């Protein structure tokens, strides 16, 4: 017998901003209960202010980062050094996934960058095909831990003004690039203490109108 998909855990978090975008993930790789690697990026730059992570099962997850960058290449070659949009890349990812549908990939992809308007944009794909635009979408194994805490501090989900008791919902505001560092670092602090596939390290890529910044923080060492 051959069981050709395993897992390597990991957890990723994509947040769309309003002048930047955040695609972050942990660097821990596992197989079962043994820690394989403490450090191992999953959040690869592809240039053009697109960051991709195809997170989950590693062997698939490296295949769609290979095949993706190969197409960044062959686009730049046959369109006279065209700048790859978020829009273009998204629909292309869709084709690359969908084409294997009799032997699917078993990863959870998320992209991030700026769109063409000077705002953040995050699209998140299921392994089969489809996609939708986001403002938060976690993925990976501790998704269900990290997502509902991000919907309560960004979108202000089910909160009302103080002492209005349901009359008027709390107003949305813009979040600074600085503030969003705190949100992502705090989620994974809480995540480590309650989940056993996350820890060691956290690598946030933050995408702006000047370049891509890697910013590395430790977590609990188990």
């Amino acid at each position: 017998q051959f069981n050709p998909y395993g897992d390597n855990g990991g957890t990723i978090l994509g947040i769309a901003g309003e002048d930047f975008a955040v695609l972050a993930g942990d660097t821990r790789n596992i197989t079962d209960y043994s820690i394989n690697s403490r450090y191992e990026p999953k959040v690869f730059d592809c240039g053009d202010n697109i960051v991709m992570s195809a997170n989950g099962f590693a062997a698939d997850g490296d295949a769609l980062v290979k095949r993706f960058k190969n197409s960044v290449k062959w686009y730049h070659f046959d369109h006279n050094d065209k700048k790859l949009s978020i829009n273009s890349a998204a629909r292309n990812i869709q084709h690359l996934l969908y084409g294997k549908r009799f032997f699917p990939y078993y990863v959870h992809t998320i992209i991030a960058g700026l769109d063409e308007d000077g705002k953040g944009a995050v699209y998140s794909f299921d392994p089969v095909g489809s996609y939708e635009r986001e403002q938060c979408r976690a993925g990976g194994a501790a998704a269900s831990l990290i997502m509902p805490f991000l919907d309560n501090q960004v979108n202000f989900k089910n909160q009302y003004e103080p002492g209005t008791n349901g009359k008027v919902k709390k107003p949305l505001k813009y979040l600074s690039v600085e503030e969003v560092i705190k949100l992502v670092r705090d989620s994974f602090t809480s995540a480590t203490e309650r989940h056993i596939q996350v820890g060691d390290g956290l690598e946030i890529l933050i995408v702006t109108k000047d370049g891509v910044r890697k910013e590395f923080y430790e977590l609990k060492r188990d």
């Binding site: 043994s34 089910n158 909160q159 008791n165 309650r194 989940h195 609990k220």
Partner: protein, 226 residues
């Protein structure tokens, strides 16, 4: 779940993790895992979480009986032979894998018992999911004839091997050191690694933030009479 039980010259020291899991999710950051058959017969348990706690409580019951019916100290063997017998009837439908340790008048002991009724004896045994890792560290540093101050360090570094490399294991490391004809000392929370950082902010909220539909006061008190 990494649980070592290391025998030494003047006693036995048995140490465990404080992590209790329910599936992949960490139920409790700190929970006890060392339980007490008898005041001189400690045990820690690995395998299925309910069936660790109850089977210890139950052969716990009958030994306490038995120690008082005999007007003498309850021996390590007494416990061992009842556990053993009890587990075999259900033919390995009760999931428990206990390291049993203890002192008694007839010396220091250390046993391991499988869910059916295999029992083994070394001078160091380990059970759990951590078993593999734990065991590696022991075989390098360990020798025959270890002092107390030696023993405890060997027990601690052994569970810490467990924490780093096993994911069913984590949080604090508990110890209980037993020496023959001296009181049994429980050092819960002996060695604390993985101390939780300060959260980036408070997530406290002003009054009135959430919406109530209705309120009431409901009574927990008995009926009164004026």
């Amino acid at each position: 779940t990494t649980i070592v039980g290391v025998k030494f010259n003047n006693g036995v020291v048995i140490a465990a993790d404080t992590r209790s899991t329910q599936g992949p999710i960490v139920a409790d950051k700190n929970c006890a895992k060392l339980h007490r058959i008898s005041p001189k017969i400690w045990c820690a348990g690995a395998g299925t979480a309910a069936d660790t706690e109850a089977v210890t409580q139950l052969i716990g019951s009958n030994i306490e009986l038995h120690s008082l019916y005999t007007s003498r100290e309850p021996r390590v063997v007494s416990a061992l032979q009842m556990l053993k017998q009890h587990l075999f009837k259900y033919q390995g439908h009760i999931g428990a894998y206990l390291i049993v340790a203890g002192v008694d008048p007839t010396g220091s002991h250390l046993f391991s018992i499988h869910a059916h009724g295999s029992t083994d004896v070394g001078y160091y045994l380990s059970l759990g999911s951590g078993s593999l890792a734990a065991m590696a560290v022991l075989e390098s540093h360990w020798k025959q004839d270890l002092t107390k101050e030696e023993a405890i360090k060997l027990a601690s570094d052994a569970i810490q091997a467990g924490i780093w490399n096993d994911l069913g294991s984590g949080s604090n490391v508990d110890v209980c050191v037993m020496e023959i004809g001296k009181d049994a000392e429980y050092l819960r929370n002996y060695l604390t690694p993985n101390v939780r950082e300060e959260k980036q902010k408070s997530y406290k909220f002003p009054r009135g933030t959430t919406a109530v539909l209705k309120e009431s006061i409901v009574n927990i008190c008995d009926i009164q009479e004026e």
